[PDB]
């Protein structure tokens, strides 16, 4: 037993789901860009579910993510990687979680050492994966922010170099 | 004489002005962001005049420039440099040009070796400066575009590194 742990875990998951739903609703109420993307309702609910938890539903971060996605889209070849992120990674984990959860509202009592334990392990793994994804997302965000900073910095530098005074512009013949 | 050259130059300038006006009108008709900035009508007409000629009135380039300006704005300290670009460089040249032009619709005939010649020289200098500015603008645009490219590239790289498959995300404990 295990079982004590398991029940608690299940409870936590349910709580999260409740809160997840609430957060989704809130997001929707503020205009929530997974309202569409490259189209199915519940195949996007999960994806939405997961992405917002990964970002602590933090509107700014979500916006940034959306922007990044848009940027990515504007090249054809990248499609694959983007799909993998969204559909393979992001949906799949959610699906797994849901499956696990169902087993818990099948009652934990009926399970056993060969299959309760296994289930628990699976759940733990899923949780770990989720955490990892969150971390990755954060990293990505950082990178994006850095880039944004960098561009600005470069522009400023350029301005300093050139746009002081007439006699500091490019020379007319090169 | 000189004077033959001068008259031609004047004519050219007038033509440009005509065409400049036309281009401005066209820009306005497409939504022309120097309709406002950090407010006076004719102190912006010139600035508008000059900037659009520098960009061959090319809408895309104009848009890019506007974006760059916006980016710059979002830091307080830069104000000075931006002002220098706009008000010191961009207006000033236009003003100079206008002044020169007036002297030509004062008739070239009344002028002389000490002051016709000087005027001509000044005009030439102004033209050179304009050309230089254009070049500088182009350079800036390039830089901006490069940055934009770069960011995207970096993002793609990051995605490749991470968002393949579950087991390629950040590790959960670092």
Quick overview:
Two copies of one chain form a homodimer. Chain A has 174 residues and is mainly alpha-helical.
Shape of chain A: elongated
Number of strands of chain A: 0
Give a quick account of the main beta sheet of chain A: strands, pairing sense, barrel closure: none
Could you tell me the strand content of chain A as a percent range? under 5%
Kindly identify the CATH topology of chain A. Bbcrasp-1
Rg on CA atoms of chain A, Å: 23 Å
Query: Given the helix and strand composition of chain A, which structural class is it?
Result: mainly alpha
CATH architecture of chain A: Orthogonal Bundle
Encode the helix/strand succession of chain A as letters. HHHHH
Q: Oligomerization state of this entry? A: homodimer
* Biggest chain contact: A-B, 44 and 44 residues
Ends distance of chain A: 79 Å
Keywords (chains A, B): Coiled coil, Plasmid, Signal
Protein name (chains A, B): Complement regulator acquiring protein 1
Report on this model:
Two copies of one chain form a homodimer. In chain A, helix 2 packs across helix 4, helix 2 (41-54) crosses helix 5 and helix 4 (79-104) runs antiparallel to helix 5 (116-162). The longest helix of chain A is centred in the last third of the chain and has 47 residues, at 116-162. The radius of gyration of chain A is 23 Å and the shape is elongated. Chain A has helices at residues 3-28, 41-54, 59-73, 79-104, 116-162. Chain A is mainly α and 174 residues long. Chain A contains five helices and no strands. The N and C termini of chain A lie far apart (79 Å). The A-B interface holds A 68, 71-72, 75, 78, 81-82, 84-85, 88-89, 92-93, 128-129, 131-133, 135-136, 139-140, 143-144, 147-148, 150-152, 154-156, 158-160, 162-166, 169-172 and B 68, 71-72, 75, 78, 81-82, 84-85, 88-89, 92-93, 128-129, 131-133, 135-136, 139-140, 143-144, 147-148, 150-152, 154-156, 158-160, 162-166, 169-172. Chains A, B: This is Complement regulator acquiring protein 1. Chains A, B: It comes from Borreliella burgdorferi (Lyme disease spirochete). Chains A, B: Residues 1-30 form a coiled coil. Chains A, B: Keywords: Coiled coil, Plasmid, Signal.
């Amino acid at each position: 037993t295990i079982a004590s742990e398991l029940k608690a875990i299940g409870k936590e998951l349910e709580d999260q789901k409740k809160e997840e739903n609430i957060q989704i609703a809130k997001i929707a109420k503020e205009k929530d860009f997974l309202s569409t993307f490259k189209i199915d309702e519940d195949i996007q609910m999960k994806i939405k579910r997961t992405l917002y938890s990964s970002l602590d539903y933090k509107k700014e971060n979500i916006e940034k993510l959306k922007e990044i996605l848009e940027i990515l889209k504007k090249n054809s070849e990248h499609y694959n990687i983007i799909g993998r992120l969204i559909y393979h990674i992001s949906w799949g984990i959610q699906f797994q979680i849901e499956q696990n959860l169902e087993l818990i509202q099948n009652g934990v009592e009926n399970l056993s050492q060969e299959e309760s334990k296994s289930l628990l392990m699976q759940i733990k793994s899923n949780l770990e994966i989720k955490q990892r994804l969150k971390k990755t997302l954060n990293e990505t965000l950082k990178v994006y922010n850095q880039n944004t900073q960098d561009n600005e910095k470069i522009l400023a530098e350029h301005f300093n170099k050139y746009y002081k005074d007439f006699d500091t512009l490019k020379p007319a013949f090169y």
